[PDB]
Design a protein around this ligand. Structure first.
Ligand SMILES: CC(=O)N[C@@H]1[C@@H](O)[C@H](O[C@@H]2O[C@H](CO)[C@H](O)[C@H](O)[C@H]2O[C@@H]2O[C@@H](C)[C@@H](O)[C@@H](O)[C@@H]2O)[C@@H](CO)O[C@H]1O
Ligand SMILES: [Ca+2]
Length: 141
């Protein structure tokens, strides 16, 4: 649960996603393993949904600072493009959203500046594309 020596409040939290394919269960994005090789077991995978999404539930309202999203790296890296990262409160009202067009490297870092939220959803905006995430780390600052 510590990453770059900061408390990752997403680690081991309940997760869900739009569907599962290739046994890529949503808990693989909070297993503390940033390995983005799908065949190594640490990467999520949905079916080609309308659209595909993944979410972590922090179980209670918390204050969200940095969210770091680690892509799949072995193949199909471009799938993680044209997507929203959305924070929802305890009643599933949208409290903040950032749009990411694509990644220049293996991850993206977003700063939600202490926004109060319970859920963090990663939602592809291109339908018919599987969502795969190696890891999603969430910090309080
Ligand atoms: C470990 C194993 O044998 N599982 C199979 C996967 O390796 C297959 O993935 C495709 O495999 C080729 C080599 O033959 C290459 O690694 C491709 O990148 C890979 O395909 C991608 O990954 C899949 C998980 C899907 O996301 C697919 O849409 C990608 O294009 C898969 C698919 O044939 O079958 C497993 O059984
Ligand atoms: Ca992982």
């Amino acid at each position: 649960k510590f990453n770059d020596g900061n408390l990752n409040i997403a680690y081991a939290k309940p997760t869900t996603q739009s569907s599962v394919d290739y046994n890529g269960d949503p808990n693989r994005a909070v297993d503390g393993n940033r390995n983005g090789n799908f065949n190594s077991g640490s990467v999520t995978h949905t079916r080609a949904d309308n659209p595909s999404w993944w979410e972590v539930d922090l179980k209670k309202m918390d204050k969200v600072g940095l969210v770091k999203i680690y892509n799949r790296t072995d193949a199909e890296t471009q799938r993680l493009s044209n997507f929203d990262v959305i924070l929802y409160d305890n009643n599933r009202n949208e409290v903040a959203k950032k749009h990411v067009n694509n990644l220049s490297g293996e991850s993206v870092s977003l700063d939600f500046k202490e926004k109060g939220a319970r859920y963090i959803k990663v939602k592809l905006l291109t339908s018919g594309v599987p969502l795969s995430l190696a890891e999603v780390e969430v910090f309080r600052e």
